[PDB]
């Protein structure tokens, strides 16, 4: 029982889960071929003579992101057909990932998801990694949520997105792709966690001291965040918590289901042996505005709920004293209709380190998945991006000429605008 | 098998260990060939290391000390820039504390013996003689070179000279300090030395 299927769509989805499966195999003991020289049942199956295979469905339209995965070190670990590729790219078009090519690929991805679920004996939920602000992560990701809801309904379709940063973008059509993908990000997903490149960039400078980190070092931190989020599932904890309680004791009224991630400590090895790592200090660092992984400063806003993922040699009486210190802090605030908003969680196992990664051996870690009204502003900034492009129909011939009716831009606008009104009426 | 497969250390240790495994099977339920973890290696021979007084110390003298290979050139401007800084790092860890922390083995890519000696006279940590084949073997093992006269086996260069790579007892790459690499921390990659968890056992 208790199986979690991970779905990765896009370049960023493949590369993030690339660090995830590296960390999962290194943690449980599975080598890059499958062999171990039933805690693995959450992310692996088991075939005969210890041939553990990940339950991933890596998905992209271009082959030049996934072909390296099937020719490098982890080519025999992964099942050869789970890595699904089309032939040409989505060209950063939503409509080319949703209205032209992709129908030849979703029939292959849904079938392999079907065999991946037949091997299960009770799925906790569909963990997902995508990149909103592109062609495959936006368009083909939206198509996957449409089909997964109608087929595999009443199941926990978690999502972890790569929402475009306020300043660093690496593209010009992400104002179009981000809010045109937020339909499935609002009506289909459940624990949609917002991540962006810029905030993990600033974390890597401040804590990890890396002045020049790359897509590797960001995906390592996201892999540790996912490892902490599914930690009582794989390992024994004093206060276990599953994906069902993330959807109940962290989520208000149903349309409000966007989170914001945080991790602590992300501190480097040269710093590591110089300071305390007590649970009161680590939740002070986890509640720092600069450690927020959305560039979405929570000093302005109101916390509706907060989920804490203490992990390691963590004593519960020290946890309750730590959250009492957080409650007595005046910088952060909680909404009036939430007396207790501090669902905690403890897993006994200390977090693992990859040999050669940027992190250090740490006794305790906290993953702080919080829902606030501050995250209205990450949609307010793309609201400003969209009406500055679409005011005179920019880049729309590329989308109408491939299948998209012109009004789909405008019903992406009150989909965002009702999202803003909903987040502003919660805190009253 | 670590860090690569096509290196003289790895083929040589593989040959010795599975020959030992065949000898044990002949004098014998043993699996052939042995596992990589079951393989044991002397990383350095008896007379390969010399200190500042040019006196030979054995490989077993390095226990409990975070040791790193320093692939260096006498005439290279990056190596000549990095060397006073490595001297200061050696001082600032090996003076401040009751226990010795870090050792640095010196592997030379210098053109000839006398310029190897002139570069090595400025350097107080351990070194390997240039004409010894162990330097050439370590170059192929850790994939360090300036230009491809050395035939790589479909691989690439892990890094270029200068290189400070923390090494283990059986020859694995513990961690790479990125002096001149894709991460590119000149002068400050030495602070990434995790001497607590990199130990020569």
């Amino acid at each position: 029982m208790r199986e979690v299927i991970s779905i990765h769509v896009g370049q960023a989805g493949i590369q993030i889960g690339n660090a995830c499966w590296e960390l999962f195999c290194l943690e449980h003991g599975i080598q890059p071929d499958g062999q171990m020289p039933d805690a693995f049942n959450t992310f692996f199956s088991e075939t005969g003579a210890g041939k553990h295979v990940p339950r991933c469905v890596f998905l992209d339209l271009e082959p030049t992101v996934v072909d390296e995965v099937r020719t490098g070190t982890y080519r025999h670990l992964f099942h050869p057909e789970q890595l699904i590729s089309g032939k040409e790219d989505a060209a950063n078009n939503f409509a080319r990932g949703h209205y032209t090519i992709g129908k030849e690929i979703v029939d292959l991805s849904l079938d392999r998801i079907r065999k991946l679920a037949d091997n299960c004996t009770g799925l906790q939920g569909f963990l997902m990694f995508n990149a909103v602000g592109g062609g495959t992560g936006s368009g083909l990701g939206c198509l996957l949520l449409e089909r997964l809801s109608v087929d595999y309904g009443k199941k926990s379709k978690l999502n972890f997105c790569s929402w475009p940063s306020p300043q660093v973008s690496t593209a010009v059509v992400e104002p179009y792709n981000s809010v045109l993908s937020t339909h499935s990000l609002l009506e289909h997903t459940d624990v949609a966690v917002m991540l962006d490149n810029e905030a993990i960039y600033d974390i890597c400078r401040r804590n990890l001291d890396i002045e020049r980190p790359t897509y590797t070092n960001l995906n390592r931190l996201i892999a540790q965040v996912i490892s902490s989020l599914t930690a009582s599932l794989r390992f024994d904890g004093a206060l276990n918590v599953d994906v069902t309680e993330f959807q109940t004791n962290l989520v208000p009224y149903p349309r409000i289901h966007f989170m914001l991630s945080s991790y602590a400590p992300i501190i480097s090895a040269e710093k590591a042996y110089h300071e305390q790592l007590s649970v009161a200090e680590i939740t002070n660092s986890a509640f720092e505005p600069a450690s927020m992984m959305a560039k979405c400063d929570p000093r302005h806003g109101k916390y509706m709920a907060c989920c804490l993922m203490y992990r390691g040699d963590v004593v519960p009486k020290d946890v309750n004293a730590a959250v009492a210190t957080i409650k007595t802090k005046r910088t952060i605030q909680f909404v009036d209709w939430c007396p207790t908003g501090f669902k905690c969680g403890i897993n006994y196992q200390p977090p693992t380190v990859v040999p050669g990664g940027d992190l250090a051996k740490v006794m305790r870690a906290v993953c702080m998945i919080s829902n606030s009204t501050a995250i209205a502003e990450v949609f307010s900034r793309m609201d400003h991006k969209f009406d500055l492009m679409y005011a005179k129909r920019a880049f729309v011939h590329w989308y109408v000429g491939e299948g998209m009716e012109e009004g789909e831009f405008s019903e992406a606008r009150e989909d965002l605008a009702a999202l803003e009104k909903d987040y502003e009426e919660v805190g009253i | 098998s670590q860090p690569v497969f096509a290196s003289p250390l790895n083929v040589e240790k593989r040959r010795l260990n599975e020959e030992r495994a065949l000898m044990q099977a002949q004098k014998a339920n043993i699996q052939l060939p042995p596992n990589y973890g079951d393989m044991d290696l002397i990383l350095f021979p008896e007379g390969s290391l010399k200190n500042s007084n040019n006196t030979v110390i054995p490989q077993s003298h390095l226990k409990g000390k975070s040791v790193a290979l320093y692939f260096a050139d006498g005439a290279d401007p990056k190596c000549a820039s990095l060397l006073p800084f490595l001297l200061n790092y050696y001082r600032t860890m090996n003076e401040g504390g009751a226990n010795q922390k870090i050792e640095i083995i010196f592997v030379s890519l210098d053109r000839d013996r006398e310029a190897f000696e002139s570069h090595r006279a400025h350097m107080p940590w351990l070194s390997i003689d240039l004409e010894n084949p162990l330097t050439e073997i370590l170059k192929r093992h850790f994939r360090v070179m300036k230009e491809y006269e050395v035939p790589t086996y479909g691989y690439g260069s892990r890094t270029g000279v200068p290189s400070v790579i923390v090494i283990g007892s059986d020859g694995r790459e513990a961690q790479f300090l990125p002096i001149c690499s894709g991460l590119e921390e000149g002068d400050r990659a030495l602070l990434r030395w995790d001497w607590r968890n990199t130990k020569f056992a």
């Binding site: 590296e22 290194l26 943690e27 003991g29 080598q31 890059p32 020289p37 070190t73 196992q349 693992t352 380190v353 990859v354 040999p355 050669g356 | 098998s1 670590q2 860090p3 694995r172």
Partner: peptide
């Protein structure tokens, strides 16, 4: 690359 496996966590 193929990273070395961490030592097993002995039960306590």
């Amino acid at each position: 690359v193929a990273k070395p496996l961490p030592p097993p966590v002995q039960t306590v």
